[PDB]
Design a protein around this ligand. Structure first.
Ligand SMILES: *[C@@H]1O[C@H](CO)[C@@H](O)[C@H](O)[C@H]1NC(C)=O
Ligand SMILES: [Ca+2]
Length: 496
């Protein structure tokens, strides 16, 4: 459950947040496969509550009504079509599995669901699954409100409602079986793994019981004995009775401290500087690298809805964001997830963004298709960070240096640092308020290399900066604190 199952040489997955199945299918063939992306995190593919107040928020998808593959992203056939086409081109699909709960207990009964299924939160009835009052933790939760009230009580965090969301009795074999039924349907269709939503709110043992019911991956695309990739969403920062290590026996876990600290370091909050990243990784109190799923920002915390708070870097902070993603993709720690978002009318009031609920680009609730502009960027308000030259090229950079050791580190005691990945890659950063001009040992073989941040190698020539490595592996780098992108990266495949 720890192996991504991506095909040899692809090292990252991209979260195509709220994309329609048809658009993801096209993206797999036209861009993801050609550019070497390993896989795609898709939004919950199961039927959710259609919320109109506010108008169709992104979070309505974390409010299950049934396990029918029927959402604003498309129907079951479109989903299967997407998984098949992506797999045929070597790009894996990872499903966002919302299995801890169903919808909010206050939601009105009726058929206000993405597929018309009837449901009645009040009486705990979800006939489309089916689930009844006997399948929820109402009688097990010991808080006065029935919701989670105190995170210092590990029991309540697991048995009570996360902000009103009906909590499934995951210790019952019936519920475990209905959930495994849903997940096995997806595995047999061809998905390679799952993001387990709200894992902190489930007992490690209950999750394990469900995983034991899972099939091996589809033998038409994967070698016999392949187990699905499992990454558990657990927000674990400082002191809490619950630790992300409690979930290691089930698969990897999301390391939220990663994006949080990279953000404060690059923003240089409270005296932090890049020279400190020298021992980045477990040295910073993070989980072991082989159990980590890392990222700079997620759909949750990019809008202030998750761990990290204000330090998190997103596409809104373009310049610093690219540099953070660059460091992540170059550093050997963890398995990397790249974010791909949509723009929304951010509107801060008293420090909080009042429009953090806004769902994906749409026309009367119908999600807009992703349009590709002539320069490869996206239209219809999709940001497509994964298509930014700077990000796409660092994705490739990680593929080229895969397996290579962390070496040749340099820092000026402040914010200009550099390091290499064996003899396959080298990257330099300048986050100080003054220029950087120095000769560094790169460990790379002599030659002329194209800087993949400022340009591309395009048939015997570079469209951007060029670096010359001498016989002893030394090379000169110049980055003024005024450069559009204050960092340079060169690798074995950008060599002329
Ligand atoms: C590189 O570009 C120059 C013009 O700037 C051209 O003379 C040269 O032939 C090009 N080399 C290749 C290999 O395309
Ligand atoms: Ca729970």
């Amino acid at each position: 459950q720890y192996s991504p199952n991506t095909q040899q040489g692809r090292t990252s997955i991209v979260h195509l947040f709220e994309w329609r199945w048809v658009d993801i299918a096209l993206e797999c063939e036209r861009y993801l496969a050609p550019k070497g992306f390993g896989g795609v995190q898709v939004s919950p593919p199961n039927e959710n509550v259609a919320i109109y107040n506010p108008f169709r928020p992104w979070w309505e998808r974390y409010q299950p009504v049934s396990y029918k593959l029927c959402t604003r992203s498309g129907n079951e056939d479109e989903f299967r079509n997407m998984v098949t086409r992506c797999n045929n081109v070597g790009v894996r699909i990872y499903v966002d599995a919302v299995i801890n709960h169903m919808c909010g207990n206050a939601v009105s009964a009726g058929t206000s669901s993405t597929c018309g299924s009837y449901f009645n939160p009040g009486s705990r009835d979800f006939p489309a699954v089916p689930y009844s009052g006997w399948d929820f933790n109402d009688g097990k939760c010991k808080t006065g409100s029935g919701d989670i009230e105190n995170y210092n009580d590990a029991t309540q965090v697991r048995d009570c409602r996360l902000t009103g969301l009906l909590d499934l009795a995951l210790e019952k074999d019936y519920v475990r079986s209905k959930i495994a039924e849903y997940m096995n349907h997806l595995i047999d269709i061809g998905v390679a793994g799952f993001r387990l939503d709200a894992s902190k709110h489930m007992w490690p043992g209950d999750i394990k019981a469900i995983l034991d019911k899972l099939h091996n991956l589809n033998s038409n695309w994967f070698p016999a004995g392949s187990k699905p990739f499992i990454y558990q969403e657990v927000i674990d920062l400082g002191g809490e009775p619950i630790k992300s290590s409690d979930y290691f026996g089930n698969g990897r876990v999301t390391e939220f401290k990663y994006g949080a600290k990279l953000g404060t370091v690059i923003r240089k909050w409270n005296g932090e500087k890049m020279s400190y990243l020298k021992n980045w990784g477990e040295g910073w109190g993070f989980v072991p690298s082989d159990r980590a799923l890392v990222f700079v920002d997620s759909h949750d915390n990019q809008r202030g809805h998750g761990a990290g708070g204000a330090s998190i870097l997103t596409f809104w902070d373009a310049r610093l964001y690219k540099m953070a993603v660059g460091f992540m993709l170059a550093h050997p720690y963890g398995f990397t997830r790249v974010m791909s978002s949509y723009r929304w009318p951010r509107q801060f009031q008293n420090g909080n963004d009042v429009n953090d609920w806004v769902g994906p680009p749409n026309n009367n609730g119908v999600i807009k298709e992703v349009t590709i502009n002539p320069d490869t960027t996206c239209g219809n308000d999709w940001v497509c960070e994964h298509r930014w030259r700077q990000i796409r090229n660092m994705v490739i950079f990680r593929n080229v240096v895969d397996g290579q050791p962390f070496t040749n580190w340099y820092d000026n005691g402040s914010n200009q640092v550099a390091f290499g990945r064996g003899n396959r890659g080298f990257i330099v950063f300048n986050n100080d308020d003054w220029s950087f001009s120095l000769t560094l040992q790169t460990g790379l073989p002599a030659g002329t290399y194209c800087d993949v941040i400022s340009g591309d190698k395009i048939n015997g020539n570079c469209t951007g900066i060029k670096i010359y490595v001498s016989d002893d592996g030394k090379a000169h780098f110049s980055i003024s604190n005024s450069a559009e992108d204050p960092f340079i990266a060169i690798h074995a495949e950008s060599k002329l």
